[PDB]
Structure formats: C-alpha cells, structure tokens
Ligand binder design. Structure first.
Ligand SMILES: CCCCCCCCCCCCCCCCCCCC(=O)O[C@H](COC(=O)CCCCCCCCCCCCCC)COP(=O)(O)OCCN
Ligand SMILES: CCCCCCCCCCCCCCCCCCCC(=O)O[C@H](COC(=O)CCCCCCCCCCCCCC)COP(=O)(O)OCCN
Lengths: 539, 539
C-alpha cells in the first residue's frame, strides 16, 4: 500500500540513497568522486531530513578517514573551529542576557518606541537587524537578536496578538508569525552582511582574491566604494524581502485569510496596547545592577568585535599581534566574566556597615551553568563543524578543481546570459556549503574566464561574490540559518518554501543593479580596461 | 566578620588568586612563565571549585592568544580533539544502551551472578572494570560501566538497602555508597589501564619513547613481558584500593553506621533478595530486537576498539592505511547506525504479508537526539579539551622543557630515594595534566638522567611510566574522573579526600614490586647492562 511510502519514506531514503548514488563512486576513479558521492548523499539526507541534521553532520567523521581524504584526527579538528567557538559563545552570551530578563526590558522599550503594531514591529526589527549586521558578523547579530524577538513575540502573545507556537519527542511547531519573525531575522542578517566589507567574511574573502589576482587594476574595492555599490541594492532587496515575508506569512496583499490576527490587532492596538505596555514597563522598576552588568558586558563584547581589524582604523588585532587573535577570545571572555562577577554587590555592607540586611550565603553570579547546558542547542556544534569539515574535504579531495573546470565550459554563452547563469550557479553552490568555501571555489575560475573572453573581471566577480552570500533555503547553508532553526525549532520544508522568494528577489535585484548601477559606480565596467588587456596578453 | 569569609570565600579566591599569582608573570620574562601562571591559576580554581570546572576550562581560549602562546584558531581547534570525539561518542553509546533499558538487564544479570551483597558486587564490578580496561581505553571502559553502575545502585535502592542521594538549585549530593561505587569504577579503570601495553595510550607512549632512545636493548617491553611485569602489582594495588574504598566509604574495619547498614542488608540478601531479583529479571520480557541491535552495535564497537592496531596480531587499522583511522570511526559510526537502524522492524510485515498491527507512522530509531542533548554532560567537551589545550600550550610555550630541566637536579639522591621521589613527582604532575603529556615531559628526561648515573634505564622509566597513570585526586587529572564527576555529581572535595588511599597504596605497591619483582621479570635491572654503558659513553 501507499501508506508504506507515506510513513517509512525517511527509512527508504536512508537505505536506498547510498546504493543509488554508489555508481558515481564506482564508475570513476579519483578520490574527487568518492568525496562527491559523500557530499551528494549528505545533501540528500539534509534536504529530506531522513536523519536529524546534527546526526547527518556527524557522517564526515566516518566517511573521510575511510575514503582516505583526510585523517580522522584532522577531520575532528576541522570541527570546533574558531568561528564555531564564536557562535557557541554568542549563544551563551544571549542566554546570559535572557537570564537576567534584560531581553524583556529591551523588548518593552522597543515596543513602546514603535507602537505595538506587529507589521510595524516586524519592519523595525528587520531594518535594525540589517543595519546591525552591516558591521558585525551575521551569526553574532542573529544570536544577539533571537532573545529580543522571543521577548517581543511573548509580549504580543500576552496582548492576545497571536500564538507563538502551534498547540499539540517532536518539539513544538512554530506559528506563521514566529516563522515570519525568525526567518526575517536570519534573512536580514544574511542580506545586511553584504552591504559592507566588514559585514561578512565572504566579502573579505573575494575582495582579497580579486586584489591578489589583479594588481594595478584601476577599479578598487575600497571601503567607501564597496558600500556605495552595495547599499542601494542591499536596501532594495531588504525591503523586498520584508514585503515578501509579510505576504507569505501575514498575507499583506491577501485580505481573504492569515491577516485576520494582524487586522484584529490593528483594530484594538490603538490605546489599550499603549496603556498595557507602559504599565508593564513601569512594573519592571529601575534597572538592577544585574542587568547593568550584563548590558555593560554585552556592549563591551559588541564594540570589542567591531574594533578587530576594521580596515578603516587600527583595530585591537593589529595590536597584540604576537598571535592571530580572532573574535572567539572576547566572547569567551564575556562568558567567563559572567560567572566571575556577582549579581548583588550587597556584601559590601560588611565593610561599609551602611546597609542593614546581610546576604547570609554565597551571592549568586550573573548566570548558572545548569542554565547554559539546558538551553544551548549543542547539536549546532556538529552541524556547523560538519559544514566546515565538508568544505575542507572538498578542498583536499579535489572537488574544488573538478567543479571549477566544469564551470569553464560556459564561455560560449552571451554576456548577460553568462552573468545570470553565474549568479544562479553561485546561489546553487552556496546553498550546500560554507559561503567562504564557495567563494574560494568560484571566484578564480570566474576571473580566468573573464580574462579569456575579454570582460572586465569585476562585472562577473562582484555580482557572483555578493550572490555567494544569498543562502536562504537550508539550515546548513549559512550559520544564521542554523542558529534560527536551533533557537526556535524550524523545519527545513517550510523554511525552503519561504526562502524560494528571497532567492528570486535577490537574484533579480543583484542582476539589475549590477547592469545599471555598477556603471554609475564603475564607469568602465562594460568596456575592457587597459590593465585587463595587459593581464590577458600576459596570460 | 568571620561569616564574611564563611559565605564569600569562593569569589574572594576568584578575585585575589590572579593578583597574588601575578608576580609569577612579572618577575620572570619568558612566555613559559606566563603559561605557568595561567596553569597555576587554573589549578587553584580547579582545586577549590571557585568557578564551575567547565567555565574554568574555557580560560585557555582567552588566555593563550592574549599571552602569545598560540593563535586563537589553533587553541580552539585543540579542543574537541579526536580522543574527545571518542569520549563523547562513548557517552552517546552509553546513552543508547540506557535508552533501551539494557543497563537494567545487565545489572540484574550481574546481581544473579554475585548475589546482591554491596561488598561483593563492588568487588566484582571493580575486577570486571579492571579486566576490561586491561585491553581498552580507560575512558571508554568508564563510559561503558557508568550506566551499569547506575542500574545496580537503582536495583539496590529498590531493595531498600541503601539511598542513592542525600535529601535536598545545585545538583543532588551523592551518598557514601554512590561515591564508593563510582570512584571504584574510575579508579579501577585507571589502575587496570596499566596492566597491558594496550591498556592505555600512556603505555604505548613511554614504550615508544624507550624504544626510540635505546635500541639494541636486550630488555624488551614487548606485549608478553610487559604483562608479566605489570599484572601482579596491578592485582595487588587494585585489591588494596578496593579494601581502602570499603574501609573509607563504608565500615569494613570500623564499627560505624555504614557497617550496620551493610550487615543488615546482607541479612536479607541471602534468599529473599535472590528470589526478588530473579522475579524482577523475569518481569523483563525476552531480550527484544531493540536491545538485540544495541548489543550487536556495542559489541562491534568494542571489538573494533580492541582489534585496531594491536601488537599481538595485525589489526584492521594496518590495512586501510591511506590515513590513520585512530579509533574515532567506530564510535561515531555506532552513533550514526543507532540513528539509522529502526527498532520494531514490524514495518516489514507489508512485504512479508504475515499480518498484525502496522506502525501507522515512522518507526523510531534506537535513540533520539532530545535524549542525547538532555543526558550528555556537554561541559565535558570544554573540561576534557582544556587538558589537551593546556598540554599543547605548555609544550609550545616551553613549560614542559622547563619542568624537565627542573627535574634534573634530583640526581643527588640515592637509588631508592631517587625512585620514590620520581614516583611522587610523577603522581603530583599527572594530578594536574593529561597522562600522555606528563609522560612525554618526564620520560626522556628520566632516560638521560639514568644514563648520567650508572642505573639501568628501565629501573626508572618503567616505574614512573606506570605512575603517570596514577591520578585519583581531581576530575581534571584523568578522563575517567571527569566522566564519573559528570555522570554522578561528585564534588571535587570528596574525590580529593578519597584519592589519598589509592595514591599511597599505588605508590608503595609500585615501590615494593618494582624493587622486588622487576628483578625476577627483568634480571640485571639492578646492574648496568653493556648496551647502557655504550649509550652513556656516547654522550
Ligand atoms: C562499511 C560500510 C557499509 C556498512 C553497512 C552496514 C549494514 C548494517 C545492517 C543493515 C541492516 C538493515 C538493512 C535493510 C533492512 C530492511 C529495510 C527495508 C526498507 C527500509 O528502508 O525501511 C526503513 C528501514 O531502513 C533501514 O533499516 C535502513 C538502515 C540503515 C542502512 C544504511 C546502509 C548504509 C550503507 C553504506 C554503504 C557505503 C559503501 C561505500 C563506503 C524504514 O525505516 P523507518 O522510516 O521506519 O525509520 C527510519 C529511522 N527512524
Ligand atoms: C582582565 C581583567 C579585567 C577587569 C575589568 C574591570 C573589572 C571591574 C570590576 C571588578 C570587581 C570589583 C570589585 C567587586 C567586589 C569584590 C569584593 C571582594 C571579593 C568578593 O566579595 O568575592 C565575590 C565577588 O567577586 C568579585 O566581584 C570578583 C570580580 C572579578 C575579578 C576578576 C579579576 C581579574 C584579574 C585579571 C588580572 C590580569 C592581569 C594581566 C596583567 C563575592 O561573591 P560570592 O563569592 O559570594 O559568590 C560568587 C561570585 N558571585
């Protein structure tokens, strides 16, 4: 009966996909094809969720050493990379923020500012997340903003606006409002990361590749110039993504259904919302030393990130350059200082004798370890590490050169068709791997092809470089996606269905504003500059 | 003001110890001394638990890049090493055993074997852990045995013979019987790991070091001779450790409250306990397919552990030699298979058309990720990776070489005094670091030192090599202690107080059986062999 395929399809996928994909390993000899078999099987498992994502990410530990691609000691060391430590520490700091109930105060403040309208709050949070991710790592901003969204949605639930999770092992199903807000936060982080060189590591990666490959090039990826090029498109597809997400979940253009909850809130969100919200903000009372310390540490951590090799002034990484200190150090420092510092300071009454009451016990610190263990989604370690290790295995096993050579054959296509196909290929490749890895795979081949067919290298590289960050479909596509799927349990199916929109929006906007606005930014993009001719003649 | 110390001593230590230890950094200029300061502060925090051990273990991530010892990326990747992946996977496999309630079945079987007497069960469990750790890694055996010990304690408590936990934010305080059993398992693993050259990585490490420095040596530390030397002493001090644990946590030689409970529970442990246990075992149905598959996978994992590069015969790691598999593949493979393999296998009724109820849904795997996240102590990742990171930073910064050069000055002592002091130093050093790291630090220095004087190199290397695994005082001294502390919440003070017994017992036992039995196993140990004379002359 069809019920067998309806119920055990996950097990059928698990049992059959390796056997069905075995021919790619059998009919070809090099280790590139063994690694391609592994990648294809892992991607198929990721898409269908035949196994838990965290479990599927464990597969490289078994596959790589057996296939001879890398040693098991190396493969495990590719997990728990520096950026993974940064992500985990950021989650810990967000949990510390939540523990002192600072997130509730911040959410009350922002709702008091905006006006308790779910559409207006959604727009404001999306815009602030985009502007913030313009300067800080995307996953850092996502882990930052998850508790704020949780508190805002909790307040909306308290006002009767909506239900956070669907009413009933399997974790609770998030509601369309919850999906909208969280997916919007993730998408805003991803989009805002592209507006500035500091915005994400992919921008630095392909900017450095372009600079090293092409010296004496008239057109520069200077810090203000890159912003001038990217901010218009960034804003345009950010607003378009916000409009699409509102249409997909809250029925912005559809009054038939799914807008009733927001329409209801709009009718009764005039004055009762204001009174309840400002009374509740009065209820919390003055800012306690607990929240003061947590907020001071948080602001310190954010600034400490931002001043690490910004490129516009001497960051603290240029100082203390004995060893390469990356952004994991400040985060773990904040996590440790959370435990080291106390939360009362009431014990000073011993020396001062001014205060009457005495704690009569050990004063609790800013956070407890049992809180961290209970709330941290520890599987994200395996998921993000698996992404990094899969990227490294793709580098070493030779998949990189294979895909790069496969990309060369597109020389026959015309100019605009070539640009569109390159953007599509970049999006498709970055859907299944770390963004920096995909940029490393794709950019040099694009540069050589551009020199081959007499095209300005930027005309192909820069749109493709920005497209490498357009990851919106799977939790494994980019760390913000994994963080959102972990903080609020979000399934992959509806996530990909939602992300089918921003992909098209970003592709179209990037193509259009390349072809039009890049000429304004770079007057000689369409033509072939002299230095490009010199490099082509040399090669 | 005494209550001020009595209530705020932990944070006072936190605030004062770095300032008091700062002269270590200020007075001496080398980076080895900065690393020494970091290690001293971390050790002081470890001993007093002024911070949670997991939080203290995070300190290297911040400290090493700041002091220039190592880069941030390398320090973070030192954590979650291959061996730590093995340990965490072993914990996950133990959880898989627990989920199918196999641990209760095994505990009931053992109770039937021995006869429901806590003294006799403790003795039997200690000896079984001994024998199994003779061939497998100590941490693997500890993770294996922890669920079985939990099950047997639960069965005893259900008989009403003992209480697992004391009466009640902090985790429950374990009772005397729980401490006795768990510390017995940890100590037995650590002891039995020294019986055989395969028992622990430290044995292979110092055997390889000795074989490298000295070649053409008539005395061989091969598989049979090493066992012949080690088994008698290992038996003696493990029996003495069992006696000490019985004497301390219970009243074996003292008439105490613990003596009364043991005898009163042994009075009803003759036939009534046997009948009750047999009935309880028969209450469990026939060993089901879920437990069948868990047992098969577990036995396969153990066999892969043992059959991976043993000296006796050619192992599976010798083939597939493109990359060194190094034991991480079997454990993660077992975890993955536990997630893939079904449990009921009743779905096959469709193809067979035999008949019966149908699943009406997906058949669950052997384990669930929610159970893994809830029960795995994830701080163990930081705690165990801290040891590896600290060892690597110590050897790169030069602390290890500093300690080795410091130990040279002991050559003025007489031979017996030299042996005693060397064993004491080895125990004290291994109390604060990984056993392999301590062996790498001390053994070559010991070899050169024994060449300097006219002393057989084995006479010093082998006793100290065995002693390097004699760590029983702190959870950070050796992985089994950390796993036992994580599984059952054992405060560092209790384990430190229990560690005097095994420490003194093993020190005296090693002294006596070296000086006596080593002559029988290795004749001419007292004298100076010709090859040693040639090696000393060539210096
Ligand atoms: C050394 C490398 C090879 C190792 C091979 C190990 C084999 C171990 C023994 C396998 C025993 C099971 C064999 C199939 C049993 C009958 C399957 C019936 C059809 C089917 O798939 O039903 C599902 C069960 O699948 C299942 O039971 C699938 C189980 C997992 C099979 C994985 C096979 C991997 C092969 C890899 C080969 C690699 C070669 C190159 C290196 C229903 O499942 P459900 O939906 O009810 O539940 C899903 C989990 N919750
Ligand atoms: C890298 C350093 C960065 C420093 C940045 C500025 C920090 C400013 C604030 C520091 C603390 C100000 C004083 C607070 C009151 C202390 C009173 C005495 C100690 C005391 O009562 O102990 C606990 C409070 O400890 C505490 O309050 C301990 C606070 C943390 C001290 C950390 C010292 C690090 C020194 C690093 C030196 C590096 C040198 C490099 C050349 C009481 O609490 P309790 O024990 O009852 O309960 C468990 C804790 N909640």
């Amino acid at each position: 009966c069809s019920n067998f395929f309806a119920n055990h399809w996950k097990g059928l996928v698990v049992f059959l996909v390796p056997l069905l994909c075995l021919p790619v390993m059998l009919l070809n000899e090099g280790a590139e094809f063994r690694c391609m078999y592994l990648l294809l099987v892992m991607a198929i498992f990721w898409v269908t969720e035949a196994l838990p994502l965290y479990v599927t990410s464990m597969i490289p530990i078994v596959a790589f050493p057996i296939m001879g691609i890398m040693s098991s000691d190396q493969t495990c060391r590719l997990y728990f990379k520096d950026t993974l430590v940064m992500f985990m520490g950021g989650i810990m700091v967000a949990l510390a923020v939540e523990y002192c109930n600072l997130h509730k105060r911040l959410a009350l403040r922002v709702i008091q500012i905006v006006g308790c309208s779910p559409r207006r709050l959604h727009f404001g949070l999306i815009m602030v997340t985009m502007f913030l991710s313009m300067w800080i790592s995307n996953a850092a901003c996502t882990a930052m903003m998850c508790p704020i969204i949780q508190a805002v949605l909790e307040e909306l639930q308290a006002q009767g606006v909506c239900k956070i999770n669907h009413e009933p092992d399997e974790p609770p199903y998030p509601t369309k409002i919850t999906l909208c807000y969280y997916l919007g936060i993730a998408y805003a982080s991803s989009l805002g990361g592209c507006g500035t060189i500091i915005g994400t590591a992919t921008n630095l990666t392909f900017k450095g590749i372009y600079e090293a490959r092409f010296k004496n090039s008239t057109e520069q990826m200077d810090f203000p110039t890159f912003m001038f090029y990217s901010v218009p498109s960034m804003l345009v597809y950010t607003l378009l993504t916000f409009v699409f997400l509102q249409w997909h979940f809250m029925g912005l253009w559809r009054p038939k259904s799914k807008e009733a909850q927001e329409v209801q809130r709009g009718r009764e969100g005039a004055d009762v919302a204001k009174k309840v919200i400002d009374q509740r903000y009065k209820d919390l009372g003055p800012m306690s030393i607990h929240e003061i310390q947590v907020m001071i540490l948080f602001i310190f951590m954010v600034v400490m990130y931002f001043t690490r090799k910004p490129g516009i002034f001497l960051g603290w990484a240029d100082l203390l350059n004995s060893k390469d200190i990356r952004n994991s150090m400040p985060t773990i420092f904040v996590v440790v200082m959370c435990f080291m510092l106390p939360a009362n300071y009431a014990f000073l009454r011993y020396c001062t004798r001014r205060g009457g009451p005495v704690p009569t016990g050990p004063t609790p610190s800013l956070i407890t370890w049992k809180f961290i263990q209970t709330k941290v989604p520890w599987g994200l370690v395996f998921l993000l590490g698996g992404g990094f290790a899969l990227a490294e295995g793709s580098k070493q096993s030779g998949m990189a050169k294979l895909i790069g050579n496969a990309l060369i054959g597109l020389k026959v296509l015309p100019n605009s068709v070539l640009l569109l196909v390159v953007i599509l290929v970049a999006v498709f490749l970055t859907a299944f791997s770390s963004n920096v890895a995909i940029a490393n795979i794709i950019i040099p081949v694009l540069a050589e092809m551009s020199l081959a067919i007499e095209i300005h290298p930027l005309y192909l590289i820069l749109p493709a470089g920005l497209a490498c960050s357009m990851a919106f479909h799977l939790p494994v596509s980019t760390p913000p996606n994994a963080l959102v799927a972990g903080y609020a349990n979000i399934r992959t199916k509806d996530m990909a269905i939602a992300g089918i929109g921003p992909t098209i929006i970003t592709i179209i906007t990037l193509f259009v504003f390349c072809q039009t606005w890049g000429l304004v930014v770079y007057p000689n993009l369409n033509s072939f500059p002299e230095w490009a001719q010199i490099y082509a003649a040399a090669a």
